[PDB]
Amino acid sequence: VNEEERLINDLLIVNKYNKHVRPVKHNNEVVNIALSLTLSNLISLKETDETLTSNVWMDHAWYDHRLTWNASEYSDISILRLPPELVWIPDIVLQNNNDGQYHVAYFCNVLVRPNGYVTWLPPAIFRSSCPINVLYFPFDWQNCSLKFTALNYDANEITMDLMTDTIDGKDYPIEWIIIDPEAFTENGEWEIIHKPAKKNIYPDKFPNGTNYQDVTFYLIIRRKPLFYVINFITPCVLISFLASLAFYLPAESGEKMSTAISVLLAQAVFLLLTSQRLPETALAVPLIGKYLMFIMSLVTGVIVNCGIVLNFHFRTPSTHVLSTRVKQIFLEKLPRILHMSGIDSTNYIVKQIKEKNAYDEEVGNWNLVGQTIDRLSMFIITPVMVLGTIFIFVMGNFNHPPAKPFEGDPFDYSSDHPRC
């Protein structure tokens, strides 16, 4: 018959294998668990909930001296398969997760070698909580970490470790989220860059506690802003540049205010669009948000200036008098500095004609004042708008994650170059 049943009965039943007892000869010693993470695919990073949903295969390995046998004795059985419900497993738990999952999703069989070496690769869907650095949205990169801990045993009983591959000759620790180049599908609007892994110890706490050791797998994910550049960015900057042209419209055609105010309405619509796409954090205003505020205040200033120009255009001698200094400075400096381009009835009618002509000439002077202040405001505002938007978006575009995943560590965690 099958020898596996006899081997299982010998290992688990005859030998009184206690599932709840740590697999160690003496209570004083420690059990080393080497674990690794394999990112099957990055499902999503919902910034409105600050939730990173990912699918990861978690690889644990340890030594259970009770699960050992003489291979030659039991018909040369090399590998053995056992459900987790029958053997001791280390409950490595994702401590930081907004959803209360805390565990792998499958609990697949463990593989046991005759020398006691046990490996286990359960898959899991993890919804971890990582804060969103929204400073340079949408040209931003996020730093989301998965923190695994051993909350059932303290560091004096089990010590979590990074798995160490055996490269030609020596063994090198695996300090990265191993990702299959062939069977990995790149996520939309997110690309992984550094993906380091590190085991951390906190000396301020004591070994006889569950807070002493952690294993953290970090993900530095850069957002692809193509969707935002196509939909939110380009139309908004185009509408802004359109508002910048309200000065070129003559005051005679009564749409000077209408275009600017309708551009303001369009920017309000864009503000409504962009509000629904970010978390309500207050670390800093997002790049899109602060650019939107800048351009909205600039459009409001353009509206105020257009109102002032219109007020100056309809000044009349019956209501206002142009002072000598005002018309002097305007009509002398600004066009040059801006390179602009019976018989009693007859007597009465001629007098009225002359008075109307003088009134018309003063109205024309007011119109010229309006035109020249309009051109001055255009030359002051349009360069400001263009330079401001270019500076904002260039500063956003130049935002890249640092070449090294950690601050002072020069190692540049990567599967290409292992250490030790």
Partner 1 sequence: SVMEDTLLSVLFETYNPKVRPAQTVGDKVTVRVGLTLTNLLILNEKIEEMTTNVFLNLAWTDYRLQWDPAAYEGIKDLRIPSSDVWQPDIVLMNNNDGSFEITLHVNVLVQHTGAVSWQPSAIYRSSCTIKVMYFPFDWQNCTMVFKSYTYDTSEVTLQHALDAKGEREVKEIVINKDAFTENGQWSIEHKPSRKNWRSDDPSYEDVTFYLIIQRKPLFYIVYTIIPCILISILAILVFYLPPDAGEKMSLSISALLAVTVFLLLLADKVPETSLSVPIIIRYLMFIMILVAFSVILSVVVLNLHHRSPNTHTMPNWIRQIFIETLPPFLWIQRIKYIAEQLESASEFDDLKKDWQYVAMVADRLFLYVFFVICSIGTFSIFLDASHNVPPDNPFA
Partner 2 sequence: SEHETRLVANLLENYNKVIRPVEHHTHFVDITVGLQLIQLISVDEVNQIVETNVRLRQQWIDVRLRWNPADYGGIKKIRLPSDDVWLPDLVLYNNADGDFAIVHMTKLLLDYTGKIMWTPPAIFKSYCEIIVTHFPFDQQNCTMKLGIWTYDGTKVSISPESDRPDLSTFMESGEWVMKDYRGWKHWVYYTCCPDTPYLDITYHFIMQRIPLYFVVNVIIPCLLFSFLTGLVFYLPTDSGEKMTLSISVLLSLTVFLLVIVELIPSTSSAVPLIGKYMLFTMIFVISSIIITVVVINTHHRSPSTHTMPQWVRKIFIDTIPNVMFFSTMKRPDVKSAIEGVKYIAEHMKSDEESSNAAEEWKYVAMVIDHILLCVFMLICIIGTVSVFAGRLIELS
C-alpha to C-alpha distances, 131 to 52, 272, 350, nearest whole angstrom: 10, 23, 81
Dig out the tokens for 41 from the structure: 């695919």
| Residue from 116, 123, 279, 317 binding partner 2 (CB under 8 A) | 123
Q: What's the one-letter identity of residue 147?
A: K
Of 164 and 300, which CB lies nearer to partner 1 in the complex structure? 300
Q: Is residue 415 part of the contact set for partner 2 (CB under 8 A)?
A: no
Dig out the tokens for 77 from the structure: 């059985």
Of 92 and 239, which CB lies nearer to partner 2 in the complex structure? 239
| Residue from 108, 111, 261, 384 binding partner 1 (CB under 8 A) | 261
Of 100 and 169, which CB lies nearer to partner 1 in the complex structure? 100
Q: Is residue 253 part of the contact set for partner 1 (CB under 8 A)?
A: no
* Distance (Å, whole) CA 381 – CA 243: 11
Q: Tell me if residue 84 falls in helix, strand or coil.
A: helix
Q: Mask: binding to partner 1, 344-363, rule CB under 8 A, as x and -?
A: xxx-xx--x-----------
Residue 230 burial class via C-beta count within 10 angstroms: exposed 0-12, middle 13-18, buried 19 and up: exposed
Q: Tell me if residue 150 falls in helix, strand or coil.
A: strand
Q: How many CB atoms lie within 10 A of CB 156?
A: 15
| Residue from 16, 170, 325, 336 binding partner 1 (CB under 8 A) | 16
Q: Is residue 290 part of the contact set for partner 2 (CB under 8 A)?
A: no
118-147 residues near partner 1, rule: CB under 8 A: 129, 131-132, 147
* Distance (Å, whole) CA 213 – CA 319: 82
Q: Is residue 269 part of the contact set for partner 1 (CB under 8 A)?
A: yes
- Provide the β-strand partners of residue 159: 32
Residue 337 burial class via C-beta count within 10 angstroms: exposed 0-12, middle 13-18, buried 19 and up: exposed
Binding residues vs partner 2 (CB under 8 A): 1-5, 8, 40-41, 43-44, 53, 55, 75, 77, 81-83, 86, 105-106, 108-109, 111, 121, 123, 125, 183, 185-189, 223-228, 230-231, 234-235, 238-239, 241-242, 245, 248-250, 252-255, 258-259, 262-263, 265-266, 269-270, 272-273, 341, 350, 353-354, 357
